Nucleic acid binder design. Sequence first.
DNA 1: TTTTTTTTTTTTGAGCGACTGCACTACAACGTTGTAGTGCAGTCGCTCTTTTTTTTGCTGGTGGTTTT
Length: 597
Amino acid sequence: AVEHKQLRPLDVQFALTVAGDEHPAVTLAAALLSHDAGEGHVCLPLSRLENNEASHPLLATCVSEIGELQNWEECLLASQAVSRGDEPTPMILCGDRLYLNRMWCNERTVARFFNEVNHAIEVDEALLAQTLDKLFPVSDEINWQKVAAAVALTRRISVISGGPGTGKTTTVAKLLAALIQMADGERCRIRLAAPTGKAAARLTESLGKALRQLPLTDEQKKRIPEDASTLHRLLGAQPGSQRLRHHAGNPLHLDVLVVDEASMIDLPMMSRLIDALPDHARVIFLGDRDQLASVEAGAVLGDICAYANAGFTAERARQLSRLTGTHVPAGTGTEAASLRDSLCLLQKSYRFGSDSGIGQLAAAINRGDKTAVKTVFQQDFTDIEKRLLQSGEDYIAMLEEALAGYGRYLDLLQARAEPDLIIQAFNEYQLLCALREGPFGVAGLNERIEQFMQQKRKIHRHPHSRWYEGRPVMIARNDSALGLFNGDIGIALDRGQGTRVWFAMPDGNIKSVQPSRLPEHETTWAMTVHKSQGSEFDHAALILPSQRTPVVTRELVYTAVTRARRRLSLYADERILSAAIATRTERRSGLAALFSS
DNA sequence: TTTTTTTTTTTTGAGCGACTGCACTACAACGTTGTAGTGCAGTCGCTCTTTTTTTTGCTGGTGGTTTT
C-alpha cells in the first residue's frame, strides 16, 4: 500500500534493535513484519517478501554460506532472532509465515480453542425440540434463528453470524429461554460481554425488553442475566499494569457467556478471554461476518466465519433435521468439521425484506460493483438516493439536503418543546464521514454545518461562549460515575435553569448534566464510521472524500449501508465507490492454514 | 488512517547484651550422689542528636513594550 511504503520509525528501530549486526535480510523482514503488524496483519507470507521486494537479489548476494541461503527459511533460521517455536525468540516461523512471538502464541491459542476444546454437549433432543417449537411460533418453512439456537445450545463453542435487523437479540433471548427451560434443576450463571460500554447498555436494554416478554417462572426470573460487562472489566484489566484478576490461575465463575459484537474483538483480547475460560463454560459469539475489522491488530471473527460459505457436515445436517424438525441443507466436502459445525449464517432479515433496497444493496456490496450500480439504478426502491459530490455547488446541495435531514430537529428546537422529542428527532438522521480533518472529515463538516447555521437564521451562536443552545455533543471517554458511555449523544439547551446538556439514558429517562461536568465533548453533526458502530439510525447519509484513502473500503461502505434503517443517502464519486468495493481490507493470518489441518 | 477500554493494596529493624532454662562434667560428702561452674539455646529490652555559611553589573551608556 501507500502507507506500507512510508516506513514508520517504530518498525525501523525494531529492525535495528532485533537484527542489529545480522544480515540486511533479517532487518528487512523484521521491518516488514512490524509494518504489517502495525496495519493489522497477523502473519507475513514469505512469498510476498520474496517477490514484492526489490532488495531480494541484494540480500541474496549479501549472505555467504555453503548452501548459499537460497530459501528464506534457512536464512531466517540461521539468525538468532527467528526460531521454530522452541527458543524464546521475538520472531516465529513455523508454516512458511513469519510472525511475532506474541502473535504466534495468540494464534495458536485461538486455533487450540477453536479446534480441540470445542466438544459436543449431549442433551435431550425431544425436550429441546419441544422448547424450540413452543418458543419459535414459525414452523412452516426454514427459519435460520431456530437452527442457530439449536446449534448454539448443542455445541459448547458456537459463532452466530448475522447482520443488523435480522433479529439477533431475539435469537439470543430464545436461546437463553430454551437454555433455562432445558436445565431446570441445574444452576445457570449467564454472563454477557461487550467490547464497548454503549453496546453493553444497548445489549442490557434489548435483552431486558426481550426477556420480559417471554413467560417465565419464579425461579426462572431469578436466573435472569444481571448486566453486560466490558471485556476489560470482566477480566479485570488495570490502567497501569496488564495484570488481570482472572488471567491464568482462577477462571471466571460462569456457566454460559454471550459475547456480543465479536467483530470489534482483536486477537490479544480474544486470547486473554480464551485463557480466562474454564473447561465447562459455553461461549456464544455474536457479530456480523462482513462487518468492519477490529480496533487493534487482528481479525478473529472474519477468519472464523470465512468457512461459513462451505456449509455444515453430513452428520450435522441430520442432527439439525432431528432437532429443528425441518429440512436443513448439508455442505459439500469436509475440511474442518468442528468449525463448520459451530458456525451459522443468518439470511432472513425481519426488519427489512426484498422489497427494500437497503438489504439488496448490502447483499450487493459483497458482490461486484456493477451489482451495486444496478441496485441503485433501477427505480431506487424509494429508499436509497445517490448525489454526486465533485464541486462546491454539490457541497451546497449536500448542505441543503442535510437541512431537510435535520428539519424536524430544528423545528422542535425552535418551537421550544420537551428535550425527549428533540433527542428522538435527532436520532433519526445522521451523517457518516470517513476522515477527521480537512474539507472532508469530522472537524470540516461540523465547522461547515456550524457556519451554515450561522449564515441562515436557524441556530443562534455566540462566538465566545462555545456552549450555544442546540449543539450536539458526544463523549469520548467512559465515565461510570455520570452513567454515560463512549459514543453517547447529548443535546445542549436551556430548560430555564441554564444551558445544560440532556442525555437519553437507555433506562427510559433523560438526564440533564452541566457542561462543566462533561469529561469529553466533541461535535457530532457527522460521525466517523468506526465510532458509529453499534448504534442505529433511521436516515443515514454517507459522505466519502474525493481523494483515495485506505479507510474507504468494502467493509466501511457495508457498515455505512447497514447503519441505515429505512433511508440512505450517498455523496461520493462513481470511481471511488467502484474502487472501494473491489479493494477489500484483507488481513493475512495463519488461521486459514491451522484450521485446514 | 481509523480507534477500545480499566479502578484493587501490599512492605518495611537488627546488632548488642542480658534473663532464664536445661544439659554436662568436676569434685567433695556420705561405689554412689548432691552441689557448683560453664555451654548452648530460646526469649526479650533497647535504641538509633545537635546546623549554617552568597558575587550576580536598577538605566554598563547607538540603551527605550504594545498600535496600526
